[PDB]
Amino acid sequence: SMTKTSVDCTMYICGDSTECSNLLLQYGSFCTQLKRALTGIAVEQDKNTQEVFAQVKQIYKTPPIKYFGGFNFSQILPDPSKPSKRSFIEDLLFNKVTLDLICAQKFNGLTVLPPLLTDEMIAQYTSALLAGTITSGWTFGAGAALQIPFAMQMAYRFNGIGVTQNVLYENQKLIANQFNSAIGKIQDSLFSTASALGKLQDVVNHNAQALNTLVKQLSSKFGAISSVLNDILSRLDPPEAEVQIDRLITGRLQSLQTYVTQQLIRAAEIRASANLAATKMSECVLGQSKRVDFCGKGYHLMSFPQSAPHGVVFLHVTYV
Amino acid sequence: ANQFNSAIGKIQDSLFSTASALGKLQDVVNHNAQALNTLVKQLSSKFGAISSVLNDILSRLDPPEAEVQIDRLITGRLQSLQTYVTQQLIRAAEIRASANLAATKMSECVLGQSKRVDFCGKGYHLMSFPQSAPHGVVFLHVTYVPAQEKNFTTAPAICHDGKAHFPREGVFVSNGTHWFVTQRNFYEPQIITTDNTFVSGNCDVVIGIVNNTVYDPLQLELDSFKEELDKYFKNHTS
């Protein structure tokens, strides 16, 4: 998802000016269109988050004993010693990706709407998905969660990639050690190797830059004597004022239309990304995929979800 | 067959009662109608001109003075048209993505059986049926849902004669006293046999292995007739 933004047209174009508002009434329903488009974008952001993360019927919990055949899930399991019961990896993700400019943006008609699902709720959904996948395999995604020992589930996954289960039962300690080493290296490689995790910051930067450009366009005269509405109203009669007011109205309306169009295009891109993320949650976390390179490089065994600011992280466990 | 008939009968109610979807088609229709309504309503805006009617401006002004109002109206209506076409392009891209998804679902759920989780409904996809709807498609996904789960004790392998036995296709289960092997998605207990199992190594590696008897039909028949042969030889000799 991305930041949900609301714009007051009258405040942005004709801030607390009645003459400018009366002149802006002559341009029809452009601003109702802009408001509708922004509302659609915000509702779509909430829908994106719901379709990615609300993929569990029940909030599954892991038993108090955290033994799963030697596998080490504590770095991705919830931490009760936290206000938001985020995991180690999730806490790292939220600390490294971080969302005056904000005051000024809020100062002329541009507000930011909070997401419907809080970060605590997204962490709860991720925790339920993780508990379901490590206590019941892929059964919880097709109906009731049926418990199975984790070693036996991993034997099922080995069968699903063409390897007999005796191989896993005879190399269980080695496989657990390798998984533990890789999941330990995740906490370094996620933030050191870079590659991705720049996508979330790119989304944040794009939204912040768009809002900054929109609020900076209020300092342009657009051919008028001044960019301040009060100055024009104080230094001219309404006949001569109307020309400058109309110039400012045209410029600010063009700025608003440009911002809303770029927002619509970016929202379409984010919707495509969220549909991909929902498909990956269904086919990599709720099941075992046979599609090549859909859930990581190699023969996909399983996947684990983690929540990140405005995004999701998939830890793909594969056989190489 | 009875379950499928009941579910397909409930479809005719749940399609229009439970709502959920089927609002997407009406949303598309409403968006298009609202866009056209806004476009045709923008013709009543003066856009700074004396009037929004072209005939009025042409009748009340000379071409020099008329041209200014005409240009104002032209700019306003051109902006309205450009806005409408841009929103139409974005909505057409969204509809194209939806139609690509629908074509993929028709290929992979109606023309085949999908192993992709939740691509053709919730549960284990059996089949799908297409139906046409105004400006859209409806997929009736028939899936298999496990219903009545029972609790069993399970082991990764069975130790019989210093050999570890693994199920060929299934899982070892026990109600508490007896050990069987069953298919993993439906309880159908079968006696553990060399036909249902394969051997790999000894019982010193697998964690959780239990002793249980693995029966050999071949050896059963062999020693069963060997006992009769021994009795025959005993009665012939003495």
Add this chain to the structure above:
Amino acid sequence: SQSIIAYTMSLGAENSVAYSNNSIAIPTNFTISVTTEILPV
């Protein structure tokens, strides 16, 4: 008498899976489900 009430979202029922060391759950029945998916074309 009904009124407008505000509340915190419930994400779903809490279900502690009876995960164990040698325990398995296996279905003895099944249900044939027919669900509906509407897609604009």
